[PDB]
Each structure stands twice: as C-alpha cells, then as structure tokens.
Write a protein that binds this ligand. Structure first.
Ligand SMILES: O=c1ccn([C@@H]2O[C@H](COP(=O)(O)O)[C@@H](O)[C@H]2O)c(=O)[nH]1
Ligand SMILES: [Zn+2]
Ligand SMILES: [Zn+2]
Ligand SMILES: [Zn+2]
Length: 250
C-alpha cells in the first residue's frame, strides 16, 4: 500500500488491541517521540531516506510474487534467503515477541510487523513476478497515467478524497470479516499471501484494456477497502497473540 493504506490498517488494529497488548504497544511507542501505531505504519517504505542499509536489506520483504505458481507458496523457490514478505513477517513476529531484546530492537520489529501485515493483504504485493506485481502494467485511470500496482496501493483509495479520519469509520462500518479462530504467527503469513495472490488473479483485476475509470473503481475499490479492514483485524489478532497473550498472570 501507499502511506494512507498503511496508516488505516494500523488505525483499524489499534482499536482492537486487548489491554495487555495495548499497554505493551504503548510502552514500546513511548520510547520514540510522537510515535503511534498509525504514524509508524509507513516507516518501512521510507528507509531510502531514513536507513539506506536497512532499506536495501529489507526491500524484498514487502512482497512475494507467487501468481505464476497459481498462488501456491514454496519458501525455497519464492523466498530464497528469507527475502520475501512471508518469511520476513514470521521472523519479525518472533523478534517482536522476544521480551529479552532491547526496546529499540522490539520497536523496529513492531514497525515491520505493522507495515508487513498491511502489505501482505495488498493483492499486488502477492502477484506476478514477471511484471513486478503489476508495476509494469501501465494504464490510464480516468485522465491520468498510472500502473496496476499503484492503482491498488493508492489510486483507488485516493478516489474517496478522504483523510484518515474520514476513511477510518468507513472501513469500520463494513461487515466484520471472518478471521482464523486463532493467530499462528508462523503459519498465517503464507495463508494471507496466498489469499492476496488469489485476488490479484481474480477475473477483471487485470483489466482487458489499458483505459479504465469509474466502472473499475466501483467494482474493485470495495475489495481494496475490504482488504484494508481485513488487514487491520488480522494485525490486531496477531499483536494480541504476540504482545497480549496474558491478562490474568501477565
Ligand atoms: O515485485 C515487486 C517489486 C517491488 N515492489 C515494491 O517496491 C519496493 C522497491 O523495490 P525495488 O524497485 O527497489 O526493487 C519494494 O520494497 C516493494 O515495496 C513490490 O511490491 N513488488
Ligand atoms: Zn505498502
Ligand atoms: Zn506497493
Ligand atoms: Zn511496503
């Protein structure tokens, strides 16, 4: 996603934290001036500016392109050296949960988990390798040139002309998605990447022409918005497992 999609995933999740996860998230955020779950959500995309070395190391962590393999993930083939979103989200979830680490280490992991649960719910972050997740599929959207990747990351969301405060309650108004009955931080990333890949391959998501407009928005913007809600609910369920496992006896 672009920055707004990332912040909205985090805003959906933030309100769904259990009291233990609320307190631990707040404690980690308090170590960095002005940090909220939402404000840190775009951080991992900003590393060319903020941390070039980490930026180069983590660039591949934002996606996993499995559509040519019919959305069936295989770590050795699709994720050599762990350099993809499935294995990165698993590892950052483990790091985040490791209470023996420093606040700085666990806050960095939190930044990645918040971002990556967003990205693993963006269809075009789990799509074709051969066109770089739709980045190479250039098209006209209304009167403006873009590409299929950017259309899904932000172009459709931008059609609402809402700031986060306007967009958030719209996402919250949707029918609740059915989640897994339990969080499994090591197994759910693959599930989510494969589901996102299947959307990238759904009929019409790749349009039959290179000139689209309101018909495309009206059909697929609801699905992008459903994916933001789902990502936020899945992020809260994951943080509740990693950071909120005990109320009594914490
Ligand atoms: O197939 C691709 C290629 C790139 N990216 C996004 O673009 C960023 C920059 O990739 P690159 O142009 O530096 O390889 C990645 O971190 C990722 O967020 C994708 O989502 N899918
Ligand atoms: Zn993104
Ligand atoms: Zn993207
Ligand atoms: Zn990203």
């Amino acid at each position: 996603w672009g920055a707004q999609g990332h912040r909205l995933v985090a805003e959906v999740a933030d309100a769904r934290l259990n009291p233990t996860a609320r307190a631990e998230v707040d404690r980690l955020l308090a170590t960095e001036p002005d940090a909220t779950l939402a404000s840190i959500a775009p951080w991992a995309d900003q590393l060319r500016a903020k941390d070039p070395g980490l930026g180069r190391r983590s660039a591949g962590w934002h996606y996993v392109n499995i559509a040519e393999d019919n959305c069936h993930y295989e770590a050795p083939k699709h994720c050599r050296n762990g350099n993809c979103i499935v294995e990165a989200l698993k590892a950052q979830s483990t790091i985040l949960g490791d209470r023996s680490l420093t606040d700085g280490e666990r806050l960095q992991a939190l930044k990645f988990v918040v971002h990556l649960v967003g990205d693993i719910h963006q269809p075009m972050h789990a799509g074709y390798a051969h066109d770089k997740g739709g980045n190479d599929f250039q098209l006209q959207f209304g009167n403006r040139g873009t590409n299929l990747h950017s259309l899904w990351d932000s172009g459709m969301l931008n059609t609402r002309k809402l700031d986060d405060a306007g967009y958030l309650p719209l996402l919250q108004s949707q029918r609740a998605p059915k989640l897994a009955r339990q969080s499994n931080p090591q197994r759910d990333p693959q599930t989510w990447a494969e589901a996102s890949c299947r959307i990238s391959m759904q009929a019409g998501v790749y349009p039959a022409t290179r000139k689209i407009g309101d018909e495309y928005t009206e059909r697929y913007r609801p699905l992008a918005e459903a994916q933001l809600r789902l990502a936020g609910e899945n992020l809260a369920q994951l943080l509740n497992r990693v950071l909120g496992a005990r109320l009594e006896h914490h």
